Coordinates of N, CA, C and O in Angstrom, one line a residue:
Chain A
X343 N 19.5 -16.8 -20.2 CA 20.9 -16.8 -20.3 C 21.5 -15.7 -19.4 O 21.0 -14.5 -19.4
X344 N 22.6 -16.0 -18.7 CA 23.3 -15.0 -17.9 C 24.7 -14.9 -18.5 O 25.3 -16.0 -18.9
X345 N 25.3 -13.7 -18.6 CA 26.6 -13.5 -19.2 C 27.6 -14.0 -18.1 O 27.4 -14.1 -16.9
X346 N 28.8 -14.2 -18.6 CA 29.9 -14.7 -17.8 C 30.4 -13.6 -16.8 O 30.1 -12.4 -17.0
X347 N 31.1 -14.0 -15.8 CA 31.5 -13.0 -14.8 C 32.5 -12.0 -15.3 O 32.4 -10.8 -15.0
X348 N 33.4 -12.5 -16.2 CA 34.3 -11.5 -16.8 C 33.6 -10.6 -17.8 O 34.2 -9.6 -18.2
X349 N 32.4 -11.0 -18.3 CA 31.6 -10.2 -19.2 C 30.3 -9.9 -18.5 O 29.2 -10.0 -19.2
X350 N 30.3 -9.6 -17.3 CA 29.1 -9.4 -16.5 C 28.2 -8.2 -17.1 O 28.7 -7.2 -17.4
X351 N 26.9 -8.5 -17.3 CA 26.0 -7.5 -17.9 C 25.5 -6.6 -16.8 O 25.8 -6.7 -15.6
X352 N 24.8 -5.6 -17.3 CA 24.2 -4.5 -16.4 C 23.0 -3.9 -17.1 O 23.0 -3.6 -18.3
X353 N 21.9 -3.9 -16.3 CA 20.6 -3.4 -16.8 C 20.2 -2.2 -16.0 O 20.4 -2.1 -14.7
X354 N 19.7 -1.1 -16.6 CA 19.3 0.1 -16.0 C 17.8 0.0 -15.6 O 17.0 -0.3 -16.5
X355 N 17.5 0.4 -14.4 CA 16.1 0.4 -13.9 C 15.8 1.8 -13.4 O 16.5 2.3 -12.5
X356 N 14.8 2.4 -13.9 CA 14.5 3.8 -13.5 C 13.0 4.1 -13.9 O 12.4 3.5 -14.7
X357 N 12.5 5.1 -13.2 CA 11.2 5.7 -13.4 C 10.1 4.6 -13.3 O 9.1 4.6 -14.0
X358 N 10.3 3.7 -12.3 CA 9.3 2.6 -12.1 C 9.3 2.2 -10.6 O 10.3 2.5 -9.9
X359 N 8.3 1.6 -10.2 CA 8.1 1.1 -8.8 C 8.2 -0.4 -8.8 O 7.5 -1.1 -9.5
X360 N 9.2 -0.9 -8.0 CA 9.5 -2.3 -8.0 C 9.0 -2.9 -6.7 O 9.2 -2.3 -5.6
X361 N 8.4 -4.0 -6.8 CA 7.9 -4.8 -5.6 C 8.8 -5.9 -5.4 O 9.0 -6.8 -6.3
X362 N 9.4 -6.0 -4.2 CA 10.3 -7.1 -3.8 C 9.5 -8.4 -3.3 O 10.2 -9.4 -3.1
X363 N 8.2 -8.3 -3.2 CA 7.4 -9.4 -2.8 C 7.5 -10.5 -3.9 O 7.6 -11.7 -3.6
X364 N 7.4 -10.1 -5.1 CA 7.5 -11.0 -6.2 C 8.9 -11.6 -6.4 O 9.1 -12.5 -7.3
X365 N 9.9 -11.1 -5.6 CA 11.2 -11.7 -5.6 C 11.4 -12.7 -4.5 O 11.9 -13.8 -4.7
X366 N 11.0 -12.3 -3.3 CA 11.3 -13.2 -2.1 C 10.6 -14.5 -2.2 O 11.0 -15.5 -1.5
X367 N 9.6 -14.6 -3.1 CA 8.8 -15.8 -3.2 C 9.6 -17.0 -3.8 O 9.2 -18.1 -3.7
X368 N 10.8 -16.7 -4.3 CA 11.6 -17.8 -4.9 C 12.1 -18.7 -3.8 O 12.7 -18.3 -2.9
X369 N 11.8 -20.0 -4.0 CA 12.1 -21.0 -2.9 C 13.6 -21.1 -2.7 O 14.1 -21.1 -1.6
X370 N 14.5 -21.3 -3.8 CA 15.9 -21.7 -3.5 C 16.8 -20.6 -3.0 O 18.0 -20.8 -3.1
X371 N 16.3 -19.5 -2.5 CA 17.1 -18.5 -1.9 C 17.9 -19.1 -0.7 O 17.3 -19.4 0.3
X372 N 19.2 -19.2 -0.9 CA 20.0 -19.7 0.2 C 21.0 -18.6 0.8 O 21.0 -18.4 2.0
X373 N 21.7 -18.0 -0.1 CA 22.7 -16.9 0.3 C 22.0 -15.6 -0.1 O 21.9 -15.2 -1.2
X374 N 21.6 -14.8 1.0 CA 21.0 -13.5 0.8 C 21.3 -12.7 2.0 O 20.8 -13.0 3.1
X375 N 22.0 -11.6 1.8 CA 22.3 -10.6 2.9 C 22.4 -9.3 2.3 O 22.7 -9.1 1.1
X376 N 22.3 -8.2 3.1 CA 22.4 -6.9 2.6 C 23.2 -6.0 3.6 O 23.1 -6.2 4.8
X377 N 24.0 -5.1 3.1 CA 25.0 -4.3 3.9 C 24.4 -3.0 4.3 O 24.2 -2.7 5.5
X378 N 24.1 -2.1 3.3 CA 23.6 -0.8 3.6 C 22.1 -0.7 3.9 O 21.6 0.4 4.3
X379 N 21.4 -1.8 3.7 CA 19.9 -1.8 3.9 C 19.6 -3.1 4.6 O 20.4 -4.0 4.9
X380 N 18.3 -3.3 4.9 CA 17.7 -4.5 5.4 C 16.6 -5.0 4.5 O 15.8 -4.3 4.1
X381 N 16.6 -6.3 4.3 CA 15.6 -6.9 3.3 C 14.2 -6.7 3.8 O 13.3 -6.5 3.0
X382 N 13.9 -6.6 5.1 CA 12.6 -6.4 5.6 C 12.0 -5.0 5.3 O 10.8 -4.8 5.3
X383 N 12.9 -4.1 5.1 CA 12.5 -2.7 4.9 C 12.8 -2.2 3.5 O 13.0 -1.0 3.3
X384 N 12.8 -3.1 2.5 CA 13.1 -2.7 1.1 C 11.8 -2.4 0.4 O 11.8 -2.0 -0.8
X385 N 10.6 -2.6 1.0 CA 9.3 -2.3 0.4 C 8.8 -0.9 0.7 O 7.8 -0.5 0.2
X386 N 9.6 -0.1 1.5 CA 9.2 1.2 1.8 C 10.3 2.2 1.7 O 10.5 3.0 2.6
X387 N 11.1 2.0 0.7 CA 12.3 2.9 0.4 C 12.3 3.4 -1.0 O 11.7 2.7 -1.9
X388 N 12.9 4.6 -1.2 CA 13.0 5.2 -2.5 C 14.4 5.3 -2.9 O 15.3 5.5 -2.1
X389 N 14.7 5.1 -4.2 CA 16.0 5.2 -4.8 C 16.1 6.1 -6.0 O 15.1 6.2 -6.8
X390 N 17.2 6.9 -6.1 CA 17.3 7.8 -7.2 C 17.5 7.0 -8.5 O 17.0 7.3 -9.5
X391 N 18.3 5.9 -8.4 CA 18.6 5.1 -9.6 C 19.0 3.7 -9.1 O 19.8 3.6 -8.2
Chain B
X392 N 12.5 -22.3 31.4 CA 12.7 -22.6 30.0 C 11.5 -23.3 29.4 O 10.9 -24.2 30.1
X393 N 11.2 -23.0 28.2 CA 10.1 -23.6 27.5 C 10.6 -24.2 26.2 O 11.6 -23.8 25.6
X394 N 9.9 -25.3 25.8 CA 10.3 -26.1 24.6 C 9.1 -26.1 23.6 O 8.0 -26.3 24.0
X395 N 9.5 -25.8 22.3 CA 8.5 -25.9 21.3 C 9.0 -26.8 20.2 O 10.1 -26.7 19.7
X396 N 8.1 -27.8 19.8 CA 8.4 -28.8 18.9 C 7.7 -28.7 17.6 O 6.5 -28.4 17.6
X397 N 8.4 -28.8 16.5 CA 7.8 -28.7 15.1 C 8.8 -29.2 14.1 O 10.0 -29.3 14.4
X398 N 8.3 -29.5 12.9 CA 9.2 -30.0 11.8 C 8.9 -29.1 10.6 O 7.8 -28.8 10.3
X399 N 10.0 -28.6 10.0 CA 9.9 -27.7 8.9 C 10.8 -28.2 7.8 O 11.6 -29.2 7.9
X400 N 10.7 -27.5 6.6 CA 11.6 -27.8 5.5 C 13.0 -27.4 5.7 O 13.3 -26.6 6.6
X401 N 13.9 -27.9 4.9 CA 15.3 -27.4 5.0 C 15.5 -26.0 4.6 O 16.3 -25.3 5.2
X402 N 14.7 -25.5 3.6 CA 14.9 -24.1 3.2 C 14.4 -23.1 4.2 O 14.7 -21.9 4.1
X403 N 13.5 -23.5 5.1 CA 12.9 -22.6 6.1 C 13.7 -22.6 7.4 O 13.3 -21.9 8.3
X404 N 14.9 -23.2 7.5 CA 15.6 -23.2 8.7 C 16.2 -21.8 9.0 O 16.5 -21.4 10.1
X405 N 16.5 -21.1 7.9 CA 17.1 -19.8 8.1 C 16.1 -18.7 8.5 O 16.6 -17.7 9.2
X406 N 14.8 -18.9 8.3 CA 13.8 -17.9 8.7 C 13.4 -18.1 10.2 O 12.7 -17.2 10.7
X407 N 13.8 -19.2 10.8 CA 13.4 -19.4 12.2 C 14.0 -18.4 13.1 O 13.4 -18.0 14.1
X408 N 15.3 -18.1 12.8 CA 16.0 -17.2 13.7 C 15.3 -15.8 13.8 O 14.7 -15.3 12.8
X409 N 15.3 -15.2 15.0 CA 14.6 -14.0 15.2 C 15.1 -12.8 14.3 O 16.3 -12.8 14.0
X410 N 14.3 -11.9 13.9 CA 14.6 -10.8 13.1 C 14.4 -11.0 11.6 O 14.4 -10.0 10.9
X411 N 14.2 -12.2 11.2 CA 14.0 -12.5 9.8 C 12.5 -12.7 9.6 O 11.7 -13.0 10.5
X412 N 12.1 -12.6 8.3 CA 10.7 -12.7 7.9 C 10.5 -13.6 6.7 O 11.5 -13.8 5.9
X413 N 9.3 -14.1 6.5 CA 9.0 -15.0 5.4 C 7.6 -15.5 5.5 O 6.9 -15.2 6.4
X414 N 7.3 -16.4 4.6 CA 6.0 -17.1 4.6 C 5.8 -17.9 5.8 O 4.7 -17.9 6.4
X415 N 6.8 -18.6 6.3 CA 6.7 -19.4 7.5 C 7.0 -18.6 8.7 O 6.5 -18.8 9.8
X416 N 7.9 -17.6 8.5 CA 8.4 -16.8 9.6 C 7.4 -15.8 10.1 O 7.5 -15.3 11.2
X417 N 6.4 -15.4 9.3 CA 5.4 -14.5 9.7 C 4.0 -15.0 9.9 O 3.2 -14.4 10.5
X418 N 3.7 -16.2 9.3 CA 2.4 -16.8 9.4 C 2.4 -18.0 10.3 O 1.3 -18.4 10.7
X419 N 3.5 -18.7 10.6 CA 3.5 -19.9 11.4 C 4.2 -19.7 12.8 O 3.6 -19.9 13.8
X420 N 5.4 -19.2 12.8 CA 6.1 -19.0 14.1 C 7.1 -17.8 14.0 O 7.7 -17.6 12.9
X421 N 7.1 -17.1 15.0 CA 8.0 -15.9 15.1 C 8.7 -15.8 16.4 O 8.2 -16.3 17.4
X422 N 9.9 -15.2 16.5 CA 10.7 -15.1 17.7 C 11.0 -13.6 18.0 O 11.2 -12.9 17.0
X423 N 11.0 -13.2 19.2 CA 11.3 -11.8 19.5 C 12.8 -11.5 19.3 O 13.6 -12.4 19.3
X424 N 13.0 -10.2 19.0 CA 14.4 -9.8 18.7 C 15.3 -10.0 19.9 O 16.5 -10.2 19.7
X425 N 14.8 -10.0 21.2 CA 15.6 -10.3 22.4 C 15.5 -11.7 22.8 O 15.6 -12.0 24.0
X426 N 15.4 -12.6 21.8 CA 15.4 -14.1 22.1 C 16.6 -14.5 22.8 O 17.7 -14.1 22.4
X427 N 16.5 -15.3 23.9 CA 17.6 -15.8 24.7 C 17.7 -17.3 24.5 O 16.8 -18.1 24.6
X428 N 18.9 -17.7 24.1 CA 19.2 -19.1 23.9 C 19.4 -19.5 22.5 O 20.0 -18.7 21.7
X429 N 18.9 -20.7 22.1 CA 19.2 -21.2 20.8 C 18.2 -22.3 20.5 O 17.6 -22.9 21.4
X430 N 18.0 -22.6 19.2 CA 17.2 -23.7 18.7 C 18.1 -24.9 18.3 O 19.3 -24.6 17.9
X431 N 17.6 -26.1 18.2 CA 18.3 -27.3 17.8 C 17.5 -27.9 16.7 O 16.4 -28.2 16.9
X432 N 18.2 -28.2 15.6 CA 17.6 -28.8 14.4 C 18.4 -30.0 14.0 O 19.6 -29.9 13.9
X433 N 17.7 -31.1 13.8 CA 18.4 -32.3 13.3 C 17.5 -32.9 12.2 O 16.3 -32.8 12.2
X434 N 18.1 -33.6 11.3 CA 17.4 -34.2 10.1 C 16.5 -35.4 10.6 O 16.9 -36.2 11.5
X435 N 15.3 -35.4 10.0 CA 14.3 -36.5 10.3 C 13.9 -37.1 9.0 O 12.8 -37.7 8.9
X436 N 14.8 -37.1 8.0 CA 14.5 -37.8 6.7 C 14.3 -39.3 7.0 O 13.5 -39.9 6.3
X437 N 15.1 -39.9 7.9 CA 14.9 -41.3 8.2 C 13.6 -41.6 8.8 O 12.9 -42.6 8.5
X438 N 13.1 -40.7 9.7 CA 11.9 -40.9 10.5 C 10.6 -40.3 9.9 O 9.7 -41.0 9.6
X439 N 10.6 -39.0 9.7 CA 9.4 -38.3 9.2 C 9.1 -38.6 7.8 O 8.0 -39.0 7.4
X440 N 10.2 -38.5 6.9 CA 10.0 -38.8 5.5 C 9.8 -40.3 5.3 O 10.8 -41.0 5.2

């Protein structure tokens, strides 16, 4: 289940290492773009939160 | 000018463009960042499928 847009939820992710390879594998990705980063270089970056 | 012929899925048309990566974009065909020109894609559901 996903919450409605007017009641959009939010989950906190911290103190863990995330792999985007298990994400890109999804076939029906149609609209995907990034502003401050590039998807090809998201596997070698660190984030405070 | 050189011509390369192949048939791909509909979901993989976005990865053909240079600069993008993927399962087909990295293991089957890749284009240089300085690619000159354009590709042409048309449906072959009538013929290939």
